[PDB]
């Protein structure tokens, strides 16, 4: 049972939700968490989705070492210096990302324009060792991810690949996880180190008012090619720099799903990625033909599974049906199917959907088509409600005077911005001091993205902080 | 093109085979190798096979951290001591295996007999940092693996699980990879540290005469439960120690496949795990209807792929068909399909199988069923020939006098042994000195396994080294 209200103590609510559903187990070494089967199944499902999608683009999986030499990497990096009692001749680092691991190989592999495009991906874990306090799924020192790295003959090929991947990330969140995101370009002050242009999908956490960078797709261009001398020969003979992309996404996505859909009873997992879509709970009166009831549950299980519905029967006699109702609600199973002697006599079943609590009586013959329609019903609704909370979380503003009241309501701001970097740094330090002063009477706002969706820009619109001619609409807010 | 003979310089043959087929790329940090897509596809296929199989047993996937504290682990272990310029308050280790990472969690999770069996697995990489020289796939400082860990209420449940997993490993090698193995029990001198009984599947490398431990399945029993206080309550109330298993298998299996099936032209990959089973090579005379020929290749591709045959068309005009013949032979594609204007006019195709070089002419209508029959033909033959080379590699002996002549022929020995540990150590040190002395005129033999398949033991048979009553037949040899 979950006891903390989501709209009061969000921290303890999230901890309770992920622990009591058997998603996360704690670990000795600060910032690392055991991912238990209940959460790993979801990671497996989104990984299968993304893998299939990128294999249709020609991306292939590989595995590069987790170690990188001090030479090639040359802040939040863990160093190996000993193999037991013996010292290393030169300390080695654990990958925080693998550009400097993979790209010397790329320089060796790419000779001719007939070698491009080169498209590799890997599923692994990386280690970014910050001493700040962690957050399960969202900010951990070790995390699982995929990272893809492509090299191309032209800039425009690489850019189209960046956008195609960003679309796949939008589908990862919105399609599988029912989390709405915003496609954007990062400012030059927040873009990847060494890249040309970083795109992103941003998500939003209403309860603390914080945007979070859900995934990233970088146009590296020729910057890394220069660093690593990755060149191809054209049909003429002339050597030219390849144009590269890199893109990544992590188990952070799981956290974002949890916070988006959970409620006071606990997890609410979208049907598309639930490892159990329907849990069948037989009623088990002592004064009843139990073998018959269980036989019919088994029949309904096979009947649903032929429609590819993922079913678990909880026939444990040492727990009441109310205990099981709570137990599978806490783990977020989207549909519960109850079947007792009355239901049997009438040839129906009772189904309760996890999102709203609504109950239905369905005849066995209509069970598979009806539940299918209901699962798409739940998924869709989970998305649209979340989409509502997204749009109600963003205030469109004209002046800096409107920032602080919008932040105190846990909202983001969409403002006309001139895109000057020094202005962003100024804005962060000022909103941070204003936040501290407000805290005294009871931090910093940054750019999250310049959205692809640009609303109308009136002709003479001025920058909301500098007064200069505004260039584009920018989404700012407090951030993870 | 591969130029080193497999039966002359096996080292350079193996290196050439794995490099020239684009399986392995070298890396700065000694003992680590980049696994390129051509090899990773095979790893993906065997991983899918094993994953499916263990999910039918109820095993679930998880992910535990790659770090372990100095406390809990308390030789070939890499230590992290710094996060950049800052020192760690207590150095941490990178997993060489995860018993000491997972089992405190197990102690927390297992309370009641209704919590057993507990069956977890993970796919990750581990780091065993030896300063000896590495061997691609076979012996590397970092390797990918799966490791499974189960806890049970009784010893016999855990033992049946150990044997079931060992059977799945036999199917991993023999069924998918067409490599024959021998099921055995390891001596107490070679068994896992802290376990009760280690089982294994052993493979054999004829060209250097060396057995290699292909995979391992340990009965831990209650030893680790005592160390970590993992206890369950029975229905009576009494706390009891759980009985545990752990089992693992790695990318070593890939190496063993390569060495088993490759020839002087290079790789020979069994059809069951080839990512390309049929490469279709159109003949492309300049004086021919090329669009027609390519159209028919595309048709044959879709026709074969509806029978679930994995097909690639190599329609590159800048390479001759002979270049492509060599190129896909080197990468080990099991079937090659050639199609030109003559074949088109006759409605047939030419197919050449990679193992023997045999050619066939098949009408399009029979293409899918015939190729299917041929792929099982290749697989089967790859296995049986390898099985032959296995059995011809083992000499059954009675006396120690027969050891050295059997080792000088690169063979293993099956000998009646009393199973005394001090005898094994004696045997290793003596065969090593005899080997060194022989080398002067131009090392050590150990036990590989006590096979499950015990041949007849005559009543008064004496130990082949000590003269004592022999206990069981034991397979010895030089080893990886
Ligand atoms: C799971 C995950 C995902 C991502 N990221 C980043 C990249 C991206 C975004 O798209 C994806 C690759 C493309 C993603 O998912 C970044 C981290 C992370 O920075 N970890 C280190 C850490 C540990 C820690 F204990 C605390 C803090 C910390 C930071 N501020 N505070 C107040 C605490 C940070 N972790
Ligand atoms: C790929 C892989 C698999 C396995 N093993 C062991 C376990 C098992 C067997 O079933 C599987 C888990 C169950 C498996 O596959 C063990 C190693 C390995 O010991 N690596 C370290 C290393 C690095 C190095 F550069 C050199 C040497 C070395 C040792 N002697 N010499 C002359 C050189 C050793 N590596
Ligand atoms: O960390 C990053 O942002 C990029 C994308 C994945 C690989 N490196
Ligand atoms: O390394 C070993 O041998 C065991 C089996 C995999 C996990 N630990």
UniProtKB/TrEMBL annotation, chains A, B:
Gene Ontology biological process terms in this record:
prolyl-tRNA aminoacylation
Record EC number: 6.1.1.15
Sites binding Ca(2+) sit at: 160, 164
* Superkingdom assignment: Eukaryota
Keywords attached to this Swiss-Prot or TrEMBL record, sorted alphabetically, are:
Aminoacyl-tRNA synthetase, ATP-binding, Calcium, Ligase, Metal-binding, Nucleotide-binding, Protein biosynthesis
> Which GO molecular function annotation, any one, does this entry have?
ATP binding
The kind of enzyme this is, by top-level EC class, is: ligase
Q: Which reaction(s) does the protein catalyse, per the Swiss-Prot or TrEMBL entry?
A: tRNA(Pro) + L-proline + ATP = L-prolyl-tRNA(Pro) + AMP + diphosphate
GO cellular component annotations of the record: aminoacyl-tRNA synthetase multienzyme complex; cytoplasm
- All copies of domain Aminoacyl-transfer RNA synthetases class-II family profile, residue ranges: 40-270
Q: What is this protein called?
A: proline--tRNA ligase
Q: Provide the species name.
A: Toxoplasma gondii
Taxonomic path: Eukaryota, Sar, Alveolata, Apicomplexa, Conoidasida
Full protein segment contained here: 215 to 711 of 711
């Amino acid at each position: 049972m979950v006891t903390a209200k989501k709209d009061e103590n969000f921290s303890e609510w999230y901890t309770q939700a992920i622990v009591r559903s058997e998603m996360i187990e704690y670990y000795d070494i600060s910032g690392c968490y055991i991912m238990r089967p209940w959460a790993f199944h979801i990671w497996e499902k989104v990984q299968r989705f993304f893998d299939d999608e990128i294999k249709k683009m020609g991306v292939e999986n590989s595995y590069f070492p987790m170690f990188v030499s001090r030479h090639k990497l040359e802040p939040e990096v863990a160093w190996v210096t000993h193999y037991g009692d013996s010292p290393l001749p030169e300390k080695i680092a654990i990958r925080p990302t693998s550009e400097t691991i993979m790209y010397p190989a790329y320089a060796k592999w790419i000779r001719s324009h007939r070698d491009l495009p080169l498209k590799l991906n890997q599923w692994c874990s990386v280690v970014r060792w910050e001493f700040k306090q962690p957050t399960p799924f969202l900010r951990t020192r070790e995390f699982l991810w995929q990272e893809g790295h492509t090299a191309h003959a032209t800039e425009e090929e690489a850019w189209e690949l960046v956008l195609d991947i960003l679309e796949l990330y939008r589908r990862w969140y919105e399609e599988c996880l029912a989390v709405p995101v915003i496609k954007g370009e990062k400012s030059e002050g927040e873009k990847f180190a060494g890249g040309k242009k970083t795109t992103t999908v941003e998500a939003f956490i209403p309860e603390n008012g914080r945007g979070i960078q859900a995934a990233t797709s970088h146009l590296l261009g020729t910057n890394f090619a220069k660093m690593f001398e990755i060149e191809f020969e054209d049909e003429e003979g002339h050597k030219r720099l390849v144009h590269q992309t890199s893109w990544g996404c992590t188990t952070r996505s799981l956290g974002v799903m949890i916070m988006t859909h959970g409620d006071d009873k606990g997890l609410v997992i979208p049907p598309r990625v639930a490892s159990v879509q329907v849990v069948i709970i037989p009623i088990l009166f002592k004064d009843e033909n139990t073998g018959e009831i269980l036989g019919k549950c088994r029949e309904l299980k096979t009947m649903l599974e032929k429609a590819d519905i993922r079913v678990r029967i909880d026939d444990r006699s040492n727990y009441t049906p109310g205990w099981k109702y709570n137990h599978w609600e806490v783990k977020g199973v989207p549909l519960r199917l109850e079947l007792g002697p009355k239901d049997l006599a009438k040839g129906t079943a009772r189904v309760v959907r996890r999102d709203t609590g609504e109950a239905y009586q369905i005849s066995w013959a209509d069970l598979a088509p009806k539940l299918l329609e209901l699962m798409e019903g739940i998924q869709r609704s989970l998305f649209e409600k979340a989409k509502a909370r997204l749009h109600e979380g963003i205030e469109k503003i004209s002046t800096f005077d409107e920032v602080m009241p919008a932040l105190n309501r846990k909202h983001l701001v969409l403002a006309p911005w001139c895109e000057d970097p020094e202005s962003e740094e100024q804005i962060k330090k000022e909103t941070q001091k204003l936040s501290e002063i407000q805290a005294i009477e009871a931090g910093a706002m940054k750019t999250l993205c310049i959205p692809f969706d640009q609303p109308p820009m009136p002709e003479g619109t001025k920058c909301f902080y500098t007064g200069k001619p505004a260039k584009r609409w920018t989404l700012w807010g407090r951030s993870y």
